[PDB]
Each structure stands twice: as C-alpha cells, then as structure tokens.
Amino acid sequence: SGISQTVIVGPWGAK
Amino acid sequence: QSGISQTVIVGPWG
Amino acid sequence: GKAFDDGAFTGIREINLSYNKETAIGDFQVVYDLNGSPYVGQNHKSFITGFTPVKISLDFPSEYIMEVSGYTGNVSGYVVVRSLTFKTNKKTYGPYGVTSGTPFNLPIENGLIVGFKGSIGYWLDYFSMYLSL
Amino acid sequence: GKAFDDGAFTGIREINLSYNKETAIGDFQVVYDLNGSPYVGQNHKSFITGFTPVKISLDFPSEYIMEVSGYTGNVSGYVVVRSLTFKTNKKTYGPYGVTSGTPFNLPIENGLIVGFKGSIGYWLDYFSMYLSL
C-alpha cells in the first residue's frame, strides 16, 4: 500500500 | 553520520 | 472511553495533560513537531472535570523523551492509567497522578517517540506510542 | 555481569534460555533469521551452572513475538530478571523462573524484535531489544 508504516509499542492500561 | 546502520532499541529492563 | 490516534510526526514539542492526585490521568494533548512546524494535536478530554493541568514544554529539538513510565490500576472498577512520568535527556517531569497499581516503563536506548494513541473515558484507559529513528 | 550485544537481524527463529525455580534466568541464546537463513547467536552464559534449559522453537516466518514480559527481583543480593514470558501470535511460552518482584512488559502493536542486548552474571541482570519494521 501507499500508507507509510511505523513501529508501535503498547498498549498499557485496560485490556 | 557513520557507515553503521541503526535501529530502534528499547530497554533496558532489569 | 473515546479512542484517539494522533498518528506519527517528526518529534514532540510539548505535552499538555491533566491528573488528579487521588485517581488517574485525565486529559491528554500533544504539540508534535512536523518537519520543523509545531503540530497542534487534538485535545483528548476526560468525560469529567476536577483535574489539574500541567504543561510539559520541551526544549525541542535538543530535549527529547528517554523514558515513559507510570502505573496502571483500578479506578471505579476500570483499569486505567493512574500516573505518568516523562524523563528526557535534560530532566524528569512527573509523576503525575497516583503512583499505585502495576508499574510499567518504556526506556529508549535509541530512537524517538513520535506519536500517541489510546482511549480516554473518565480517565486515560490505555495508550500506545509510535516510535521512529 | 558480562555485557552482551547481538545487534540487529531479520527476525527470530528460536530462543534458548535457562532458568532455576529457586533463583532466576541463567543463560540466553537466540537463533536469529538473517535474510531468510538461520544465524546461530552467541550463547550468553551465566558465571554459574545448574539451570534448566528450554528451547522456544518458533514457526518462522508466520510465528512472531508480540509481547515480552517478566519480573525483576533480588536474588542473594543481585537485582535480576527472575522470570520471562514470550507471547507470540500463536502461543505463550512461559513463565520461566520465579514470578515474584516488580513486573515489566513490552507489548508490540507494530514491528518486530530483531535483536537482544544486555548483561549476564550469575543471572540475567538486564536486557534490551532492537525493534524494526
């Protein structure tokens, strides 16, 4: 796809 | 700026 | 609560949050950088009032966050984010909120937090962080 | 401890660690992927022995780690990682070790663990992870 991607860490809190 | 590539690093834990 | 996702940007200029010293994190808003311009992220508001605001004005670009840490725990029977602490290469801001429940921390040896997403109802329910080099 | 740093690779095929119920995590060795080939990492061994080995063999490439968690605590004067748990898109492996002390967890919404660094002495003192798309 033409959508750029980024590392994401998480989530912290409610499951 | 060097010839060494880099990476995200998270930590430490301990 | 209501989900938000600010997306990814170039860096962080300022964080504006609210907290209550007996409950949790409330409001959450970020001024990012975007290729050298301030990007005023939307104000993600708690459903309720009574919080204390704090403005974390970073000296961007020389100043940047090295660790986000805090506590998650129960408030009125929801698991929420109870406290936050933002440590940069220059100083520590927080803890804001209540330092009780389950610790969590994201230290960073290399790279930058460039974005936040998560969910706020009466309090900040959960959040994640976009990371980049 | 002796500090170690594997560096960054393409992905993880296999984890070999060891633990002792009485104490904490002892040894750690990763088989990485490197451009679609296994590359056997350096075996990072404790100063002492007596641990119980385990091998975590992932179904690479379709299986990957989504969350690392564990506990840190004090063993005979040493503050160390006393247990570890590795959650993939497929299964949970662990906990291995004593699940008492202060918790930690790294959960991942997007991206891959591609590398490990840290320090091992009598036990695993600390570790960090390289992250990549």
What DSSP assignment string belongs to C29-52?
EEEEEETTEEEE---B--SS---E
CB atoms under 10 Å from CB of C100, counted, come to: 12
* Spatial distance between the Cα atoms of C59 and C61, rounded to a whole number of angstroms: 6
Q: Catalogue the E-assigned strands of chain D.
A: 2-5, 11-19, 25-34, 37-40, 52-57, 65-75, 78-88, 92-97, 102-110, 112-120, 124-132
- D67-96 in b/e form (b: 16+ CB < 10 A) is ebbbbbbebeeebbbbbbbbbbeeeebbbb
A8, A14, A15 ranked by CB distance to C129: nearest? A8
Rg (CA), chain C: 14
Chain C residues whose beta carbon lies within 8 Å of the beta carbon of residue D111: 131
Neighbours of chain B (3+ CB pairs under 8 A): C, D
D105, D108, D110 ranked by CB distance to A5: nearest? D110
**Which residue range(s) make up the domain with D14?**
1-133
Is B14 in contact with D119 (Cβ distance < 8 A)? yes
3-state secondary structure of D129: strand
CA distances D25 to B1, C78, D45, Å, are 37, 34, 10
Closest CA to C49 of C18, C85, C16: C18
Q: Could you give the strand order of the β-sheet that contains C25-34, starting from the edge strand earlier in sequence?
A: C37-40, C25-34, C11-19, C52-57
Q: Could you tell me which chain B residue has the CA closest to the CA of D114?
A: B7
Q: Count each helix (H run) and each strand (E run) in chain A, helices first.
A: 0, 1
Map tokens 């247990």 to a residue. Answer: D83
Tokens of A2: 């033409």
Q: Which amino acid is at C61?
A: P
* Spatial distance between the Cα atoms of C94 and D112, rounded to a whole number of angstroms: 30
Is C118 in contact with A15 (Cβ distance < 8 A)? no
Closest CA to C103 of D91, D65, D73: D73
* Spatial distance between the Cα atoms of D65 and D82, rounded to a whole number of angstroms: 20
Chain D residues whose beta carbon lies within 8 Å of the beta carbon of residue C102: 103
Report resolution (Å) to 1 decimal.
2.0
CA distances D54 to C62, D60, D62, D64, D71, Å, are 44, 18, 21, 18, 18
The residues, any chain, with a CB within 8 Å of residue C119's CB and separated by 6 or more, are: A13, A14, C1, C2, C3, C4, C125, C126, C127
CA distances D77 to C103, D20, D127, Å, are 22, 16, 19
* Spatial distance between the Cα atoms of D111 and D132, rounded to a whole number of angstroms: 6
CB atoms under 10 Å from CB of D101, counted, come to: 19
Total number of domains in chain C:
1
| Solved with | X-ray
Is D107 in contact with A5 (Cβ distance < 8 A)? no
CATH code, domain with D2: 2.100.10.30
CA distances C79 to C106, C117, D42, D130, Å, are 19, 17, 40, 29
* Spatial distance between the Cα atoms of C78 and C87, rounded to a whole number of angstroms: 27
* Spatial distance between the Cα atoms of D95 and C11, rounded to a whole number of angstroms: 36
* Spatial distance between the Cα atoms of C109 and C119, rounded to a whole number of angstroms: 27
- Asked if D80 contacts D124 with a C-beta cutoff of 8 angstroms, the reply is yes
Tokens of C76: 């009125």
